[PDB]
Design a protein around this ligand. Structure first.
Ligand code: HEC
Length: 104
């Protein structure tokens, strides 16, 4: 649905690892420097896996939804300790939130 309905859940259980809207901090995942229509091997000084960066997929409304619904399965060895998001609303809410953070 909506940007409010996504930022409210991002700032709860994404910003805990990917601080961005509050101020950049890649403290347990890479801070989302837009991502939508960008690329994966894009983060500053952090460390994770080989898998995500080297293999890629282009981050977009498909791939990041497909990824957030199961990140461990979607890219081979991506740890990301959360792997789902309450209900399928918060999912599309996040997409439609972050889609502003790539043009606003
Ligand atoms: C800390 C335990 C995390 C939580 C909570 C969330 N994410 Fe995550 N994310 C985490 C890791 C360790 C990584 C690095 C990549 C790897 O392969 O391990 C990621 C990665 C992402 C990405 C992809 C970045 C890329 O590979 O280019 C995205 C788009 C992402 N994470 C988004 C995201 C959102 C929206 C979250 C809240 C629902 C979220 N993550 C939680 C660790 C953690």
């Amino acid at each position: 649905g909506d940007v409010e309905k996504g930022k409210k859940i991002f700032v709860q259980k994404c910003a805990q690892c990917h601080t961005v809207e509050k101020g950049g901090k890649h403290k347990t995942g890479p801070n989302l420097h837009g991502l939508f229509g960008r690329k994966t091997g894009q983060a500053p000084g952090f460390t994770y896996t080989d898998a995500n960066k080297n293999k890629g997929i282009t981050w977009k409304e498909e791939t990041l939804m497909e990824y957030l619904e199961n990140p461990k399965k979607y890219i081979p060895g991506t740890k990301m300790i959360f792997a789902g998001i309450k209900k399928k609303t918060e999912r599309e809410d996040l997409i439609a939130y972050l889609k502003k953070a790539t043009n606003e």
